[PDB]
Design a binder for these strands. Structure first.
Ligand SMILES: [Mg+2]
Lengths: 97, 87, 106, 95, 95, 106, 82, 97
DNA sequence: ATCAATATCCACCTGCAGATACTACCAAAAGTGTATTTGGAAACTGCTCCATCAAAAGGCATGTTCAGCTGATTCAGCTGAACATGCCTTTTGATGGAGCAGTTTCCAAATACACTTTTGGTAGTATCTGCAGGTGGATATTGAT
DNA sequence: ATCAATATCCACCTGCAGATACTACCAAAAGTGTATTTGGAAACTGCTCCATCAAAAGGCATGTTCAGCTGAATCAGCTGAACATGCCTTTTGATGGAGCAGTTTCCAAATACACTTTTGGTAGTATCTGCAGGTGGATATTGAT
């Protein structure tokens, strides 16, 4: 059988996902998370479906940009693997923590 | 309504592969095993902050429905302006 | 019976802009040239984005500009990128960009 | 029956001027509408502040002008100032 | 020759309640004044947006309240809200 | 002849705040309680900072509050620090803080 | 002895700033780098300040011009009016 | 002939400067640099004394904070010496780049 | 461990820079009395939002295997810290000199107001067409050897 | 280099979701001429701002010297990628029911606006005093041996 070397498929996935624009998180699970978090603030809330979609677009755009920053931090440390300490450094320098 | 469903642990609905895809879009080649829980936590904070402001706008308007506009205004306040949903 | 738009040589609606300036309570009084100048700026900006966006459409063999095209236009252009540095275009994706060290071999 | 204005017909005219055989999806138009509203509020906001700072109660084309120089980056600022000046001048002599 | 308005006296009164034998430098007062002005502007600006979002012509204490909740951190918001409602209650029941 | 500030039981000028709200173009109309509420909130926050600032002077063997004390008060308190997270207090300096890896090997 | 104004921001002063920022050890290249950053900082802020001056039809930059410039640059300064 | 180990005086200066609030750039050279830069935007300019001061306060507070982030970046790469790449990384994550 | 060089700590003293305190106006508060303007309260009609269930349609979860990355170790070379000696720039402070902000007072142009008429832009209903998604077969990239 | 498994490519086909095409009110432009109001304009005057130089006051540049940091090299332990397999969960497209937005028309409560009396807050000006900065002497830190 044929096997790609570690990192080859990963680079493939980078090109593919950088080329496209669809949401990468599943519609329903994300919806549940929204409803749960919101419910904890206020019971008996409804959501315009486009309110949920706006949250998803915002959330995914935040996370993709955080990973770019995180990646930069890993590479700064002369690694190619992102770690929680990379996310934390990004968020600290961003003024989020 | 016959009853009402209990929402718990829905953060785990944000799967490892979905998180991997977002990293990929973010140009990430290699991912440590701990990233997934870290990201879940970071996403949870993000959503809490935005939903809290969105819901505050909803309540101020005396509605029970969170509108796209509530979310857009919430996003704007937090310096994360979104285009494509009405503002 | 002439529109102020056509008087100014503009496609963007001066009447509208004057009105929105009033309702936004930006000041007590709005001068007559304010909405004319602002409508021209707005029109200029949208022409600049539409130009580059249409080009991105074309580079992708498309007739219809979609959000990805607007995103390519903005992010590939230094000044539009800064103007919109803190804005998210829904369904825009990102620019293809892989860091050097991540590529194979030496 | 509920009524809602947008800048869409204007965006479409301008589109037709720069790319005669090019269309635009409704979501792309929605982003274009957002963009115009967004820049409208930023310019008007800066103009608002600028007036206040100078104890004026009027927002004139000069306030918009300064707001544009404050808001826009280098080369876009330069060109928007032309088109604004140009339009104002034409509007004065056209009337 | 012109009168230059400042929150300084009120700041000073409040200093006296809180720390009766403590004074304050010129600069420190200037900072406190900036702080009041800033917070004023932020609260008002947010209240302003609320009214506009909701197609109302008035800024009522309800807008100020929501504004405070939007701007202030958790515990600071809570107390500020109670201080505000308190002040409004005392003032209404005043013959 | 009795002030609205005394009516509301406040040190901060309800009259001035009302005026400042009108002449701020924040909305067409300003309700009666708004300046009362707003004034209270401003007074409150001032007392919060002045308290901690006073304490800071105290700890430094001083009776007059200077910018340094306002800095120490603000940046040592999580909430004030966040509220003022994008503000610079002239002549405030910084909190003493050295990263532990920079410490010599005890 | 000419020497451009930027170089007036000396090694030891940059060293001092680093110190207040809790910096222990400093590479020789930092000094030039810092000057570059300071220049970009000053450009952005001064530009907006002067734009305020010009608008007011003045020939003097006021403290308030600067304060307003810093505000809009997301760098609110307290203690100089406003 | 007594001599202090490398870094001992550095640490001492950290404590000293973190303790105080004086501006750390000499006024005059800063004034020239301000005026020089202003000159490209408008010629024959005058400056209120407090305007220069405001600019210095803001600049020095800016640079001090940037050195904090810079320092964190150096420590992230397991160093104790700040380098241009550390400044560059901090500014990139801040959105200044 | 000892011994000493230098940094740091505390107490006490003192004049003056920078506080607080006392005063004589007056712009802007509060008072007083109509003049509009507002945004619940009730009462509609009427969608979107929610809930469910079935089928369809795909992505997720888990185990296995090993490539190659991370982080520990050790090392030497170079670079940045320390510090002496040595010069020159910044700080200070009249001076005083003058420029230009900021003060006041003017009126003519431009803005708000109001009404009456005339659009242009929007919501309703009914044809057109980019392209998403499928498929084909030609060719590129990757990795074994 | 060749050889083969698998990904990628580009181009064409096709029905259909999402465009663009024609249409009929009406909220909102435009027009027109009373009536207000602003903010340039012009002429001031008085603080601050620039310059000078005088003083001293002081900080910074340069050279040498070596501690110890950063980066290269080497390597093992093991994490994280690739991919096979089995099955749940999300997606999609129904339906129907209620729950709540959103449109409209009432007036009572509230805020504007104008005008008249009565301060509280400010600038000027005159006292008071925290504490910066210096001095001395005790002991702590650091670094050498
Ligand atoms: Mg819950």
């Amino acid at each position: 059988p044929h096997r790609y070397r570690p990192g080859t498929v990963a680079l493939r996935e980078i090109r593919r996902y950088q080329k496209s624009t669809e949401l990468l998180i599943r519609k329903l699970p994300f919806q549940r998370l929204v409803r749960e978090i919101a419910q904890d603030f206020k019971t008996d809330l409804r959501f315009q479906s486009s309110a949920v979609m706006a949250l998803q677009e915002a959330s995914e755009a935040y996370l993709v940009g955080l990973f770019e920053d995180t990646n930069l931090c890993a590479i700064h440390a002369k690694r190619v693997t992102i770690m929680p300490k990379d996310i934390q450094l990004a968020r600290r320098i961003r003024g989020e923590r | 309504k016959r009853h009402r469903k209990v929402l718990r642990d829905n953060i785990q609905g944000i799967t490892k592969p979905a998180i991997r895809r977002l990293a990929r879009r973010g140009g990430v080649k290699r991912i440590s095993g701990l990233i997934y829980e870290e990201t879940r936590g970071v996403l949870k904070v993000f959503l809490e902050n935005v939903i809290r402001d969105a819901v505050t706008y909803t309540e101020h308007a005396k509605r029970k429905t969170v509108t796209a506009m509530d979310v857009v205004y919430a996003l704007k306040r937090q310096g994360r302006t979104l285009y494509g949903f009405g503002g | 019976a002439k529109t102020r738009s056509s008087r100014a040589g503009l496609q963007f609606p001066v009447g509208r802009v004057h009105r929105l300036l009033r309702k936004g309570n930006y000041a007590e009084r709005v001068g007559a040239g304010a909405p004319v100048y602002l409508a021209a700026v707005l029109e200029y900006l949208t022409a600049e984005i539409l130009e580059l966006a249409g080009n991105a459409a074309r580079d992708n063999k498309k007739t219809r500009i979609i959000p990805r095209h607007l995103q390519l236009a903005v992010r590939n252009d230094e000044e539009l990128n800064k103007l919109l540095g803190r804005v998210t275009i829904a369904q825009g994706g990102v620019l293809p960009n892989i860091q050097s060290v991540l590529l194979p071999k030496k | 029956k509920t009524r809602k204005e947008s800048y869409a017909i204007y965006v479409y005219k301008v589109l037709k001027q720069v790319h005669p055989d090019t269309g635009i999806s409704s979501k792309a138009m929605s982003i274009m509408n957002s963009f115009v509203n967004d820049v409208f509020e930023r310019i008007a906001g800066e103009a608002s502040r600028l007036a206040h700072y100078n104890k004026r109660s009027t927002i004139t084309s000069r306030e918009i002008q300064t707001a544009v120089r404050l808001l826009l980056p280098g080369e876009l600022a330069k060109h928007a100032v032309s088109e604004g000046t140009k339009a104002v001048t034409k509007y004065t002599s056209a009337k």
